[PDB]
Amino acid sequence: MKYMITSKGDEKSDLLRLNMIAGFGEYDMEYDDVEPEIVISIGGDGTFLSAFHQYEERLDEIAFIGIHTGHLGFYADWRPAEADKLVKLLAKGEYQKVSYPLLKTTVKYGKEATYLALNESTVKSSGGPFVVDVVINDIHFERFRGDGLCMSTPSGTTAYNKSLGGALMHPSIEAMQLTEMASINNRVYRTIGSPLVFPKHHVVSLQPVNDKDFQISVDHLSILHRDVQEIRYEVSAKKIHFARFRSFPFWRRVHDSFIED
Amino acid sequence: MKYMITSKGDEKSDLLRLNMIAGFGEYDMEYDDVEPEIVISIGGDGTFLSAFHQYEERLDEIAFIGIHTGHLGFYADWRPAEADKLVKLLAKGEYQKVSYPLLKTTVKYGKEATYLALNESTVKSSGGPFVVDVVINDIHFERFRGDGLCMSTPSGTTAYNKSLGGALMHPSIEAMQLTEMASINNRVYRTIGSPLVFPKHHVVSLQPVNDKDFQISVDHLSILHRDVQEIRYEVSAKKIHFARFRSFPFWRRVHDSFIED
Amino acid sequence: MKYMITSKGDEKSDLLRLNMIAGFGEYDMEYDDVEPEIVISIGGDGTFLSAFHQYEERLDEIAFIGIHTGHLGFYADWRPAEADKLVKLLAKGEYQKVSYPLLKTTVKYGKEATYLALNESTVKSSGGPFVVDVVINDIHFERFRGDGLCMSTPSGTTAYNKSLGGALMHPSIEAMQLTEMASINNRVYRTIGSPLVFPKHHVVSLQPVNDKDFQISVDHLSILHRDVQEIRYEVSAKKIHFARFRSFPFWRRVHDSFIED
Amino acid sequence: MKYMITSKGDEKSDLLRLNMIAGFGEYDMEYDDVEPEIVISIGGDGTFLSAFHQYEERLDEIAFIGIHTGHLGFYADWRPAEADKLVKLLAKGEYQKVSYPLLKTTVKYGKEATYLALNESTVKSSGGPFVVDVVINDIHFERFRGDGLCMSTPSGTTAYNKSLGGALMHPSIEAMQLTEMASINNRVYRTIGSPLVFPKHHVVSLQPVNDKDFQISVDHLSILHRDVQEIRYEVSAKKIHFARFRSFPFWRRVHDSFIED
Ligand SMILES: NCCNc1ncnc2c1ncn2[C@@H]1O[C@H](COCC#Cc2nc3c(N)ncnc3n2[C@@H]2O[C@H](CO)[C@@H](O)[C@H]2O)[C@@H](O)[C@H]1O
Ligand SMILES: NCCNc1ncnc2c1ncn2[C@@H]1O[C@H](COCC#Cc2nc3c(N)ncnc3n2[C@@H]2O[C@H](CO)[C@@H](O)[C@H]2O)[C@@H](O)[C@H]1O
Ligand SMILES: NCCNc1ncnc2c1ncn2[C@@H]1O[C@H](COCC#Cc2nc3c(N)ncnc3n2[C@@H]2O[C@H](CO)[C@@H](O)[C@H]2O)[C@@H](O)[C@H]1O
Ligand SMILES: NCCNc1ncnc2c1ncn2[C@@H]1O[C@H](COCC#Cc2nc3c(N)ncnc3n2[C@@H]2O[C@H](CO)[C@@H](O)[C@H]2O)[C@@H](O)[C@H]1O
């Protein structure tokens, strides 16, 4: 099929990219970065996140592959030594696909702007104090005040959700996880403290109380939104599709990254 | 249908039980605690847990109801003032049922003994140090050492999973959650630290390293097992069925219990 | 002696201020906000922090007083109903003084700029990733990467140190506490995780690795410092002096603020 | 002076002990385990804790030494390769001494029994639910309910206090730290959550509410006390004295044990 390859930009990733292109030149494979069918990321998870968001509008027609030229990643989880065997098996095709859930973020102004996240989306305050009303399925749940909130995808739970105390969820679970950032709790102010895991079709809505300006991040893109009326989180109907050529369990990927490898 | 009622034993729960029986006497309802179809628990979640385990072998033929004579519970979530309206609506029938997942615990000796848990099951050490090899889907994940482990159901996440830092999961998610109890982490000893959420059909196996005696709890029953070879956790194929007569969202039940009511 | 009074600015605090001035007019008390001897803060802890930093260069010649027109504060810990009894006892004098330790922050450029903090001082990253080398008494302790670090005074432990998992220290302990903000820990990256409590004369030094621009906060003043070479934390030789007219134990102040009042 | 040596019991520690005795035979050094002046522990921190409690009644006349035949310990912090240089420098004497604070535990019945702890002392429940009234300096602070409480010494903060979220305190700080074990917090039950650091002369008192039987641990000795009326914690007036022959900072000892060595 059609294919393209992104690279971290350093010398190791660029040269491995040119070697896979040359290996792809030995099959009916056409290099195309406009409407590709196979996107190969060479670098870390950050390079993979850039590859995802570069083609987020054709997710249902693309199978992603991750090659880590540095330490093992959760999305770039194949060694550079396996590039040649990767080229052939991708060349024949007939591979199976695995799908991970995505997080849809909707931001309303006083105008709507939606986003898709592979890791997570965070809300923080532009300078001053951060206070939100957290509304779950139109039911007011709590008035949060602290440094911010993080809504994570299943595969994003090992990223930044994890540093905030959140649990690690297997990516086959269609859900999203919300974690707190330095919440203040006293007799007057009250948050749940525990992380929350929401299923599909559950809508978590963040609504402002005083300041209406928020620093909103979606994966690695962070933009200050002004005059914000609402932030809506829910598990997306779209999914990201990986091409699998070997067996690499998520919990094994967790073991190698955090226990020892 | 046939029905029975358990009571916490105090005077308030016993008298409310006799008043519901008298109200049930005004319909074709037969009191039977051998093969009931409706089990009504009057008390707290502890009384409800006793009611569940009393009829754990007929779970697919029973719809449970919880009435809290004290503070609001997550299973006993209906006020005593709503007992009369409860008797009639249960009398007519035609109610809908909601189902929560359960945790199957398997304990092997050198002999097998399986259990069902509505909240969680915990493993701790009989006196000395607690060390386990944690095996996920036959893959060795970590060597845990500390005070113990807790494997929680979705509706058990607000119980004791919560005190151990675990996340709160909506009970519609067929999953189980594992939390650590005072794990020691240094250069020599390494645990994941984060809680783990496992989907259906995933098998978490605990295996001993030195001591083979463990204090194993399943909800509120705690028994010391000797000569233990393995402890297997997985989401059960059985589910507990509640009869619902009103709308009481889980997140609303979480709000009232931990934020304010 | 000479005295001045700051006010939160709202109508309740301004009018209580004019009533204490009128009550002070009935004694030999001279209102002076240039070289006062008694600084009375009317408002919350935020108003008290502004009062502290307004007179941080004459700390050894001032006894502070806090009056909370809203909820109880840890520095503004006297009810407005006790203002009249406060005016007289401050008028006679002969009060005893209590002293809390302070945190000295030193920031070096490529030039030095020192600060004093009553609550804490935090280091965060200007936009991009936050990586630091943490050096304790010239010994390299760890390479921190995450959202930031917080170095807290004893009386600042109930503030923002507390939201970050830190312990609450009695203000008689001459020490400082360091807490982490969303540290990432894997096989490759390693932080201590636990909060650290340092005694007097111990010097904690933060040193950059890549980015040399940091958002540095000292209590409520937050300023982006550019071209930063080092950030040095240590317990200050200066102390803040409170005038005490009653008995209000710190742990009682903790109980009323976080347990119930 | 007089000296004795304890050993972990394995072959490596026993033979290193006989080699130090033979090396001590080359000086005026008399082996005496009744009234020694130098206690040398060969093993881990556990062997050192046994050595401490073996001579807890002559602490002001003993300087302890720790040799780790396994991984580095916080009390056994000298390599076996440094045993010969250790024998000579201990033989000459003229060494300096460092002192760490200790925790005094007082247990009253309905009779008093006091203990000394080098790491910590914990209170847990004999089977059933664990509820305590926590009283600080005769002021009731909170009603704790959960799995237990841990009161730690400064040098015990890296032990088991650390697994419970507590902070690490430099051992020059005369203080004690209290951490919670799986506390339950809802609208009805309320604990501080944060760890508490108490100075000298502060008295933390645990008092029962229903069950009067508690599993009380002091370092590695754990005994079930029946008919308990009170448990009193406070920094002891006694201190443990180490002989120092090199420079080994506590924070360096923390770095090697938890970061990397
Ligand atoms: N207001 C607070 C400011 N703080 C932050 N602001 C914004 N983002 C943040 C913040 N603090 C962490 N992040 C995480 O960085 C990602 C940036 O994109 C690159 C990546 C990645 C990645 N993805 C995963 C994954 N899925 N699982 C496991 N490790 C993963 N990583 C690892 O993160 C490191 C690089 O970041 C490397 O070790 C990668 O191996 C964000 O998506 C977020 O997850
Ligand atoms: N080795 C460590 C020893 N420690 C422990 N050993 C054993 N069990 C423990 C331990 N520490 C907590 N527990 C929890 O007690 C349950 C006992 O059964 C009664 C109950 C309950 C209950 N269930 C829920 C729920 N589903 N959601 C939310 N609150 C719930 N509660 C509340 O718990 C309190 C009573 O316990 C009351 O406030 C109830 O409102 C166990 O199932 C376990 O969850
Ligand atoms: N990069 C992360 C961005 N996040 C933050 N950036 C900057 N500061 C922050 C941040 N998140 C919390 N803070 C804290 O706010 C203080 C601001 O000054 C006002 C105050 C106060 C105060 N002082 C105490 C005290 N000593 N003990 C107990 N409560 C106290 N408060 C209470 O804080 C609330 C107001 O803040 C009120 O409830 C007060 O009762 C800072 O000094 C810091 O402690
Ligand atoms: N109801 C709950 C049941 N749980 C527990 N019950 C009782 N004790 C417990 C429990 N869980 C941990 N402990 C700790 O074990 C100590 C036992 O004595 C041996 C030791 C030690 C030691 N001391 C230190 C130190 N000062 N600093 C840093 N590491 C240290 N260790 C390390 O602990 C490991 C051995 O334990 C080894 O890695 C040692 O390197 C107790 O004093 C307590 O600290």
Author numbering:
A (entry chain A), B (entry chain A), C (entry chain A), D (entry chain A): 1 to 110, 114 to 264
Publication text:
Nicotinamide adenine dinucleotide (NAD) kinases (NADK) are ubiquitous enzymes, which catalyze the phosphorylation of NAD to nicotinamide adenine dinucleotide phosphate (NADP), which is subsequently reduced to NADPH. Since it is the only known enzyme producing NADP de novo, NAD kinase plays a crucial role in controlling the intracellular balance of NAD(H) and NADP(H) in many cellular metabolic pathways. Therefore, NADK represents a promising target for the development of novel antibiotics with an original mode of action. Here, we describe the synthesis of a series of functionalized diadenosine derivatives based on the chemical structure of NKI1.
The soaking procedure described previously for inhibitor 1 was used to obtain crystals of the target in complex with compounds 2-5. The resulting structures showed the same overall mode of binding to LmNADK1, the ligands occupying both sub-sites A and N of the NAD binding pocket. While compound 3 failed to yield complex with the crystallized target, compound 2 soaking led to a complex with the target. The structure showed a clear change in the orientation of the adenine moiety located in the subsite N (syn vs anti conformation), while that of the adenine moiety in the subsite A was maintained. The purine base flipping positioned the amino end out of the target, while the imidazole ring of the adenine still stacked on Tyr163. However, the N6 spacer arm appears to prevent the usual orientation of the ligand in the subsite N due to van der Waals clashes with neighboring residues, especially Asp150 which is normally hydrogen bonded to the N6 atom. In all three cases, the spacer arms appeared flexible in the crystal structures (weak electron densities) suggesting they are perfectly amenable to column grafting. The introduction of an aminoalkyl chain at position 6 of the adenosine residue located in the N subsite (compounds 2 and 3) led to sharp decrease in inhibitory potency. This finding is consistent with our previous work describing the affinity drop induced by the introduction of a N6-cyclopropylamino group on the adenosine residue located in the subsite N. Introduction of the spacer arm at the 5’-end of the diadenosine derivative (compound 4) resulted in a slightly reduced inhibitory potency as compared to that of inhibitor 1 (NKI1). In contrast, compound 2 showed a different orientation which could explain its increased inhibition constant.
